[PDB]
């Protein structure tokens, strides 16, 4: 008579259409609530009391403009639990106060933990090394730094990203105008990893597909492959010669090639997370001091760097009153920075 | 411009003049490069996960592959068996040719659309404009996140090339 | 008595080129911010 | 341009210390018995 823990372990790890596992006990509720919260909020829930914004299909928004918006700045970093001291158990008030935002962020965080645990659990059951789990640490570092650490360094959850397409675009532009985020070398390494990752994806796929051996008679070549076959389906030797002659260098080790494909985008995302942790504290790469000293003394000195700061100053002045309503900004027309005519 | 900060200047002005973020071809572009990076990491991790043991604990596993060897260096059945259980069985590629075609196609198509975004906003067919799209029963504008984007775009617009415009509309 | 836990260390030429590229490009990236 | 005076030594050491680390490892790899 084996005990209940082992009986439960058996049932959890049965081979079924959707694997459950111990990790599924955490993953499936939290992922479902995170996704369901987003669909519920973008379909039915307003942002009038937190942002002065409509944000749902019910109010007339579309897929690009709906969002589950962050709570009001006056909530601070409240967990905003439904039973907490702000909503005090009132589901309607909870939605009006932004409780769905922390609901989604927190269930999403634990869901991501559950998913990485699932990657470990399945890898261990089938007998492969858990590099897929290791690669997933980059999405987790991005989510934790952007949706948790960044607002926790700022005044409140209000300045976290809101969960929506246009809301996320606003977040990009805010980071340009207030943080000069494009100037940040940690964001630049992130860009390099994403664009380099997309490059590796495209070039590897294209190379395999254009150095295939003829292993069948079809003009469509997909059927001439068998998953159990021993032989490489494409010529590493021919691919190596082509790239050596075209580009100067080429892969020669297939294992190094595929590890590099993990390394590049994963490292890029990790570097971007580090920059955002800095931005949590307003520790920006905002200025080059030597540039400002020269420009302040020499009114004929101009670079693309000084041109972008003027753009940032426009962004801040023109977006802050409606984007930060709790500040009650009134900027009389005469104080708004503007070039000629426009 | 041919420079790093000049690139950012081009992007910011472009957003002011075309609302490129709200253009679906740029959105396909982002899906292309985000997806390209994801599938890169994915493919890299799955093949690496299934390397056949050919080395000892103190050697790099890369020495387990010899350039030009005839045998495949990883167990794609093992990798597929892992990935099919992570999502569900039919969501995974067991055909290496289909898999690598997908890896080529997804970023290439998305970046094609990115390029077509720039090339069609070149003729001023711009991103979606939902400015003041939501109106209450009296007629008050009820702002959405699109209107907040518009406020940021305005700041870019009024400041860029601050000495170059003499007339009220920036028509090119 | 000799320590049996010692092992030789290796860095092949490709790794040298990869590492120098990483270091030099990182330096090219971060130097502007060091000068500020 | 009034740049940070420590920028030069910082960049120089940033290049030289890890580059020299790799050169040491490479050369002592080449010199091992073949």
């Amino acid at each position: 008579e084996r005990g209940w823990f082992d009986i439960l372990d058996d049932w959890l790890k049965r081979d079924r259409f959707v694997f459950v596992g111990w990790s599924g006990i955490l993953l499936f509720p939290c992922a479902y609530l995170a996704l369901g919260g987003w669909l519920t909020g973008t379909t039915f829930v307003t942002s009038w009391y937190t942002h002065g914004l409509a944000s749902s299909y019910l109010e007339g928004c579309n897929f690009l403009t709906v969002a589950v918006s962050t709570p009001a700045n006056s909530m601070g970093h409240s967990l905003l639990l439904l039973w907490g001291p702000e909503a005090q158990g009132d589901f309607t008030r909870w939605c009006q106060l932004g409780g769905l935002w922390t609901f989604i962020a927190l269930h999403g965080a634990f869901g991501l933990i559950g998913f990485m645990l699932r990657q470990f659990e399945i890898a261990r059951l089938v007998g492969v090394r858990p590099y897929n789990a290791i690669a997933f640490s980059a999405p987790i570092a991005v989510f934790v730094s952007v949706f948790l650490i960044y607002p926790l360094g700022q005044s409140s959850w209000f300045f976290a990203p809101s969960f929506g397409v246009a809301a996320i675009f606003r977040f990009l532009l805010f980071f340009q105008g207030f943080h000069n985020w494009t100037l940040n070398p940690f964001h630049m390494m992130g860009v390099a990893g994403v664009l380099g990752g997309a490059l590796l994806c495209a070039i590897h796929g294209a190379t395999v597909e254009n150095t295939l051996f003829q292993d069948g008679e079809g003009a469509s070549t997909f059927r001439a492959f068998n998953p159990t076959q021993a032989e490489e389906t494409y010529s590493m030797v021919t691919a190596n010669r082509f790239w050596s002659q075209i580009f100067g260098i080429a892969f020669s080790n297939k294992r190094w090639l595929h590890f590099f494909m993990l390394f590049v985008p994963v490292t890029g995302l990790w570097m971007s997370a580090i920059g955002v942790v800095g931005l949590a504290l307003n520790l920006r790469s905002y200025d080059f001091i030597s540039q400002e000293i020269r420009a302040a003394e020499d009114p004929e000195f101009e670079t693309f760097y000084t041109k972008n700061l003027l753009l940032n100053e426009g962004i801040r002045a023109w977006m802050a009153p409606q984007d930060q309503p709790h500040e009650n900004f009134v900027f009389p027309e005469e104080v708004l920075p503007r070039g000629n005519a426009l | 411009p041919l420079g790093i900060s000049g690139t950012f200047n081009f992007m910011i002005v472009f957003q002011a003049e075309h609302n490129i973020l709200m253009h679906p071809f740029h959105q396909l572009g982002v899906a292309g490069v985000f997806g390209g990076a994801l599938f890169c990491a994915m493919h890299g991790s799955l093949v690496t996960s299934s390397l056949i043991r050919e080395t000892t604990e103190t050697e790099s596993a890369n020495y387990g592959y010899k350039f030009g060897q005839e045998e495949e260096t990883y167990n794609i059945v093992a990798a597929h068996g892992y990935f099919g259980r992570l999502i569900f069985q039919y969501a995974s590629f067991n055909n290496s040719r289909s898999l690598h075609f997908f890896l080529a196609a997804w970023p290439v198509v998305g970046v094609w659309f990115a390029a077509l975004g720039i090339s069609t906003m070149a003729f001023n067919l711009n991103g979606f404009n939902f400015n003041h799209s939501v109106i209450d029963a009296k007629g008050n504008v009820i702002n959405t996140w699109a209107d907040i984007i518009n406020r940021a775009n305005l700041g870019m617009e009024v400041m860029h090339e601050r000495n170059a415009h003499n007339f009220p509309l920036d028509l090119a | 008595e000799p320590n049996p836990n010692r092992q030789p260390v290796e860095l092949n030429r490709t790794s040298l080129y990869l590492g120098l590229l990483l270091i030099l490009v990182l330096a090219l990236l971060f130097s502007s911010y060091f000068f500020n | 341009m009034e740049v940070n005076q420590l920028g030069l030594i910082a960049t120089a050491l940033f290049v030289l210390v890890p580059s020299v680390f790799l050169i040491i490892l490479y050369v002592q790899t080449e010199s091992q018995q073949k």
Binding site: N240, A250, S252 | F67 | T14, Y17, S31 | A12
Partner: peptide, 30 residues
Amino acid sequence: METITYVFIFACIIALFFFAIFFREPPRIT
């Protein structure tokens, strides 16, 4: 001194390209 530093690092990178291509470890079939 900053310009010299930037141009020096760039020049080292171009030199590395030269060695990485023409003085690479030759790919060999075993």
